[model samples]
Target: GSSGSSGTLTVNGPPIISSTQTQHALHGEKGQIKCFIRSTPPPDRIAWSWKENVLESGTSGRYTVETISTEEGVISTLTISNIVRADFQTIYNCTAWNSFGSDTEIIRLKEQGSEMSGPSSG
Candidate 1:
């Protein structure tokens, strides 16, 4: 018989954004935009901002952002109410910061100007 000792596992890699996507659709016809983010080690702080103009906390529109535990690590989400055509052309950014470092995910909403109108009636 032989005996083996256990050892700790160490990972040498910078924190990164696991999942990020742009052009997220609104909820029904409410004109709301939603953004989802996933990262490693979790973020000490998370924020969502519209383009480079304003931050969600300072904006008047209803906004929601949260971080949830996930198998990968932590999942962050942001939702903006009353989205409009102008919003479609803006860039939504998700910023996460911690003692270790900070990372950000940028999502540019695609403009659906002409497509916004419903399909032509037969």
Candidate 2:
């Protein structure tokens, strides 16, 4: 005969991307940056902005997923097109808010130069 006991299990919150780093690239080259976050009960609204610049509503650069799962949560993505040297010096923030509370993640852009080709021998 065997006996078993049950214990109470609780999950704190949903899964999030948290902090993200920009891909390696050179100045004036195209690159992508991402921000990560965590939330519970599935966030109701998500927003992405650069420094103090708020992207226009219905912009294609912003992407989001509402209510990932009961245990997994959701994830939001922001894509920057035509990355420039100036963009590397600024900070990007992603904000997720719900009736319960709000969470934000700030990601700094870094410049990672691309590979260069030297003189080739014939």
Candidate 3:
């Protein structure tokens, strides 16, 4: 048997996240405030956190993060279920990483049906 000289794999490009989701009715709550993104060689790390606190399994009672594989790439999401007000402090710092590097995105949660602002990369 001959070897073709296998070289280490390389990861290219940066992480890209989807737009943030906003909520208005505090009581109604946002069923699923989701975050989507893509990366090369698949993201080794993905997290949905509040103010960069981060979430795992069931971090905050009303907050949970989920992941799934898509035809295009990968998707990481965060959902909240509570009667709470939104403020700049309510920003959810989402991050994803691969063998290459990492990317952190910020999603601001605003009440009163305001627009939700988010950065694809940070």
**Number of the predicted model whose lDDT against the real structure is largest:** 3
Ten residues in a row with the worst lDDT in model 2?
Answer: 62-71
Q: Candidate 3 vs. truth: CA RMSD?
A: 8.3
Model 3 lowest lDDT segment of ten: 111-120
Q: Candidate 2's residue-wise lDDT over 1-122, tens digit each?
A: 54776679655543345676557756655455544455556666766666777553344543222223334455455555466677778777777767776777777776664464555568
Model 1, position 36, has a per-residue lDDT of 40
User: Between the candidate structures 1 and 3, which one is better when assessed by TM-score?
Assistant: 3
lDDT of 3 by residue, 51-116 (tens): 546675454766767877876577776666664655334767777877777788777765554554
Which residues of candidate 1, in runs, are more than 4 Å off?
A: 1-14, 21-38, 53-60, 111-122
Q: What TM-score would each prediction reach against the true structure?
A: 0.62, 0.63, 0.66
Q: Per-residue CA lDDT of candidate 1, range 27-79, in tens? A: 43333334343445666676777655544343455555555667555666555
Best-performing candidate as measured by TM-score:
3
- How would the candidate models be sorted by TM-score, starting from the highest? 3, 2, 1
The 10-residue segment of model 1 with minimum total lDDT is 28-37
Better of 2 and 3 by TM-score: 3
| Model 2 vs truth, CA RMSD | 6.7
